[PDB]
Amino acid sequence: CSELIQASSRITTCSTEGVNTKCRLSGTALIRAGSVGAEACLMLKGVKEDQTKFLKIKTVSSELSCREGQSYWTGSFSPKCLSSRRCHLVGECHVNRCLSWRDNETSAEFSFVGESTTMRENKCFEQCGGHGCGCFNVNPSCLFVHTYLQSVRKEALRVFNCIDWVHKLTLEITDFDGSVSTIDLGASSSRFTNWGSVSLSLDAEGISGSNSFSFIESPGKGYAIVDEPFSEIPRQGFLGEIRCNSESSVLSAHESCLRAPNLISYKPMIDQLECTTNLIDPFVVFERGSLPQTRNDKTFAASKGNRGVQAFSKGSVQADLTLMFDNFEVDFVGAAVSCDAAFLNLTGCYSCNAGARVCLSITSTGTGTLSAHNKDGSLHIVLPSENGTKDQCQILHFTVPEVEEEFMYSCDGDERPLLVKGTLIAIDPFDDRREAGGESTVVNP
Amino acid sequence: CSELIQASSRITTCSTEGVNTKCRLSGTALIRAGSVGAEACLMLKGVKEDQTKFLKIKTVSSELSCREGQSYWTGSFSPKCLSSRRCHLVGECHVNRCLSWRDNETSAEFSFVGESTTMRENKCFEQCGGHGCGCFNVNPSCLFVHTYLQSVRKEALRVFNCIDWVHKLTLEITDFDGSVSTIDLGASSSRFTNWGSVSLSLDAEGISGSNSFSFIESPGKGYAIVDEPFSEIPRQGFLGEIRCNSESSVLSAHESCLRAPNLISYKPMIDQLECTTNLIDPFVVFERGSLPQTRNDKTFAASKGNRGVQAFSKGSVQADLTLMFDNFEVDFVGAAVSCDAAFLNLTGCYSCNAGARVCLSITSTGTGTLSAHNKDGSLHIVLPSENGTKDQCQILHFTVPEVEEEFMYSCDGDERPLLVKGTLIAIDPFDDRREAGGESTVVN
Amino acid sequence: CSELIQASSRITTCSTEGVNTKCRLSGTALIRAGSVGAEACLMLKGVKEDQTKFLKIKTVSSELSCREGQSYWTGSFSPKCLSSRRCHLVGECHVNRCLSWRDNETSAEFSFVGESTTMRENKCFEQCGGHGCGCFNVNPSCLFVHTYLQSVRKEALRVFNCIDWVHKLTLEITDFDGSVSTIDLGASSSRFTNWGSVSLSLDAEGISGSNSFSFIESPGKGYAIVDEPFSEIPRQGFLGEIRCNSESSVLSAHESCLRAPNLISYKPMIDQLECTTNLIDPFVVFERGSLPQTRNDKTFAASKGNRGVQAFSKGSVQADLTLMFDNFEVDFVGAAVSCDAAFLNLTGCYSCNAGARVCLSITSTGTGTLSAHNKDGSLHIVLPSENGTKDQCQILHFTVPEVEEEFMYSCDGDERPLLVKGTLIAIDPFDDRREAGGESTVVNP
């Protein structure tokens, strides 16, 4: 039992017309959701008849469903190139030709390159002429290049943002006979029950904080968070500098894909050539932000079977529920009971978005809520208690490798100490760029 | 009538100072705003005298006003260039000079060019020498270039961010005599009425979510949202890579404008030259985010009365109102009545920021609030009901082209099925970069 | 006294264990925090005995503690380069060698330079040959370049984001015996007192708005806000395009530092060479966002003891408090008293992130809350009133240089006019890039 009640009243509702007005006297209880696992135990008494009725209302979960917005596919790409050098006055290497080369025109040096539907480009670099470089003509020679992209892996990744976060509070309700039911509530919503009604009257749940983020789906392999804003168009140095509208087009490096300017770099070396890319590896990004991840005590994880991502509040929930009881009002509420907590472990890293996981062993005799805090109240642990002994865990963020933090916890208001002690690893500054490519295939030596 | 009351009590208020303490007995009611169009119907009874009065409070709107922060003007620019190639040892084409050319040095080749206050730069590219390139000297020739920018349109765009979102809750109150009045409430605000007072005692409204955004003003042509962080300094590939401190500076491409480094590309071709830019077209950006736009159930629109932008809550409203009645208390509240709802149409795109529009026909016999949800509650619809038949719409976000979703709706709690069905279009990945410029005009 | 009460009730609470029940009758009040400085004055009456008790609850502060995530060090860097031009067939200037030069290979031209652990790179640029350029050989000459980075100042900056914002609400309570005490509340937290309990039963405080941001620490000289998303990897044109894992690595410009590609530009001039950078100056960014800073009525400032940054609500506080009194209930609450307010000054910028500071002179005869709004309610002022005459200030945001805004204010609901007037300065579009570097030191052949 939890002490969740905020107000208790009697209210008459009148079906105004249909010429014959009907009134219903309802007992009213304004209660707080409190936290996941918190349970209001309400003994009701008949307003009119001498009758009693015991009700239990439990906050089971608080979820925000991500309704997706813009979306694209991407993957790991690598350049492959063909090269050929012609001396001045040989082949296409005349007057303006080399300096005038366009991206979309394939050189005659590569007449075997047929019809392509792959991301590709063509280049011509002026190299040295004269006897010193194997030519009779002393004017600049021409290095012709043809380059296409290819998928390193045969898997792709879909990046998307979230436009809507649709709240759903779920409650478990125990009736007088002990029969259990669940209900779902949206913002400003009401459900009817056997004994009256329950309504989410004030809702303060949402994504709040100071960081923009986005998500990645790996088909059949889960989701990942990206701790950066969703890039709307392809930009060099960002996730999605190459992007497509389908998984298959990533794998084939189809030409319908978009890419930011100048992603392919060229190192002319007379008769040798290197074409390289220094692109963001989206799979490295995925492995870091791999779900579940917790940010501002929202835990983002894969939905039941749904797919798509939800944000779970596994601790405190900020919502007011209005309870109306047909012809019954509050007689008394059930008092909270004390719990015993022991420290189990602290695992993870410091100065990182993923944070650290602290685990507790919590022993009690009734359902309720453990609340804990450090001295200055910068850390806050909120975990469920039950009849028996269960292990509960939540994410915390620290900025120090050697953690030794004293907390004060209780389920019933009498605080006792508890020392959280652990060793966290550092995560050194990283780069997601990966070099790809190398020597070209020389066509005519 | 909407069912909004959460508590009812009597409270006494006493003055603590003065020649004498005065006491006031007041009935007190705590209600939820519920949603736009929701109306609380309260019948009051006298606490000491035997009297009744009927009172009605309606939530008319919930607005967040944008108070702007940093701002800048931008637009569409194209490059114009002059070119002149000199053989080595001719003109300025001496020793180090070509490879040492500064952006702010104008070549003697272009003396005919007047005094400028336009964004401009100067380049020198080494080119081939010898008889093959029209020169006796075999050393590199010098291609001298003078480039300036010009506005492509004679209009500009103003980009800004929002630092403050200030809440204004608007209520319609009907007194006992049927007299209607309007009040506006901000955070922790109270306003006195004929019959007591009403105060916004708890406010949970605000901009939330996982996206940062900014806005654009097109002078005389409304507003647009940008689904991206406001960039505070000029950056290539971003809105505002060229920016100014005024509209007139954009139109004249004034030299006071800032631009990110290396925005003009050069393709030297001996005696031909191309100077191009690949700039973000801000007008393409404006059109895609043109207001009104909905994000996380906030509808962004131009404020009423000329300018600034606003965020409207057109469905759910999360706010608590404390009502105080002088010498009166709650007798009873009005019950909600049922809605009939029919699905009209569903129009728009999927997997897009703008979303899709569901339209419904709602028939009722009193003012209230339609509430609808799909099977797993990932979709939620809140629209106002009235006496009679009205069309109500709201934005939803889907991720599939063929939508067929069953909803359960009600105004009074008696839920009935409603099937939303339709076809949404795809929005293929886009790029706002547009190529501009071309060949130089050749001087000799 | 402030009028903060929202509801009042009686509840009976029963303990279920022991295996006989004890029941306690309690009076209940639901009040709003209202604002910093708001004070609820309750006189209580006995539920069973006839007795009176006096109680005072005051909102002292509402804080959001930043728990940090990813962090990195950065600073100001400048390049220094050595150059030496060799004619073709002299030194290493053979065949392919110049066009094939790798970044981490040091030329023989600079053997006199010892080995460094500094960020550095090496280049080779082809230049003109023949008699025109000081060579007998007509083939291209080689300009060899060795560049290294160095810190411009002997100080560094630490950039970080905030993953968690942990709420602490602070109340000052005067109990039945006149004893004054302070208590702290987290989300969904409860505290037992001499007279019952107070719980933070609904919390709507948190960071909201349409902007992402991050923070910088200047060691021993405070903090600054950055009005932009935290960049998770080094990127050109962004804060942190060069970044390190320690302060000492910034000062020594250590090679362990990461940098975005292509940060050093090269201008080869046959026997002259310039190496430059166009880097974001982080100290200019720091100065612009130096704390305290206010965004969406949250004031960001350094914590006391200077451990982290904090977000203060200095005006409105959106929170509901459930008060429970053992064997007592609400008799009456103290009425609000009136304010007189005079406009002092208006100082700051328009169309700026920092905004402008409005200062007011407020006179009252009791603690309370001044509330003000302009004609259309787009501007909102909430300041604390006290016994006597005090200066109160807060940040507003305007978009015009000549401000003249008409407000209506009150503490007790009786609105009176107040004219806010002043001149604000413009902050013209800026660029934080600063050019650094210059000519190389030329080695004698």
Ligand SMILES: *[C@@H]1O[C@H](CO[C@H]2O[C@@H](C)[C@@H](O)[C@@H](O)[C@@H]2O)[C@@H](O)[C@H](O)[C@H]1NC(C)=O
């Ligand atoms: C309010 O303060 C009263 C004394 O404060 C005096 O301070 C002077 C600086 C000047 O402002 C005088 O006008 C003030 O009277 C004190 O007598 C009252 O008891 C105080 N009231 C409360 C409710 O604490």
Ligand SMILES: *[C@@H]1O[C@H](CO)[C@@H](O)[C@H](O)[C@H]1NC(C)=O
């Ligand atoms: C290639 O590019 C040029 C200009 O860049 C364009 O005019 C032409 O239509 C393009 N297509 C082909 C097939 O050359």
Ligand SMILES: *[C@@H]1O[C@H](CO)[C@@H](O)[C@H](O)[C@H]1NC(C)=O
């Ligand atoms: C931490 O404790 C939990 C709870 O017993 C356990 O499941 C987990 O394996 C522990 N982790 C480590 C690293 O010991």
Ligand SMILES: *[C@@H]1O[C@H](CO)[C@@H](O)[C@H](O)[C@H]1NC(C)=O
């Ligand atoms: C609580 O758990 C204990 C197990 O030791 C059991 O004996 C008791 O009956 C349980 N009580 C309830 C109410 O389930």
Ligand SMILES: *[C@@H]1O[C@H](CO)[C@@H](O)[C@H](O)[C@H]1NC(C)=O
């Ligand atoms: C060119 O720019 C430099 C600074 O980059 C400046 O010192 C110099 O005066 C400029 N040249 C002219 C001719 O103004």
Ligand SMILES: *[C@@H]1O[C@H](CO)[C@@H](O)[C@H](O)[C@H]1NC(C)=O
């Ligand atoms: C959809 O219905 C709305 C409301 O009835 C109407 O305004 C609109 O024209 C309709 N649109 C389509 C595409 O049918």
Ligand SMILES: *[C@@H]1O[C@H](CO)[C@@H](O)[C@H](O)[C@H]1NC(C)=O
């Ligand atoms: C509904 O509107 C009709 C007019 O169309 C009116 O006659 C009737 O009184 C209204 N009913 C209610 C309950 O307001």
Ligand SMILES: *[C@@H]1O[C@H](CO)[C@@H](O)[C@H](O)[C@H]1NC(C)=O
């Ligand atoms: C340059 O880097 C390569 C690895 O790519 C390494 O093998 C080589 O030894 C490095 N050169 C020097 C001089 O250390």
Ligand SMILES: *[C@@H]1O[C@H](CO)[C@@H](O)[C@H](O)[C@H]1NC(C)=O
């Ligand atoms: C404005 O008034 C405040 C309050 O007294 C004062 O601290 C500040 O110095 C004043 N500023 C100016 C610019 O006059």
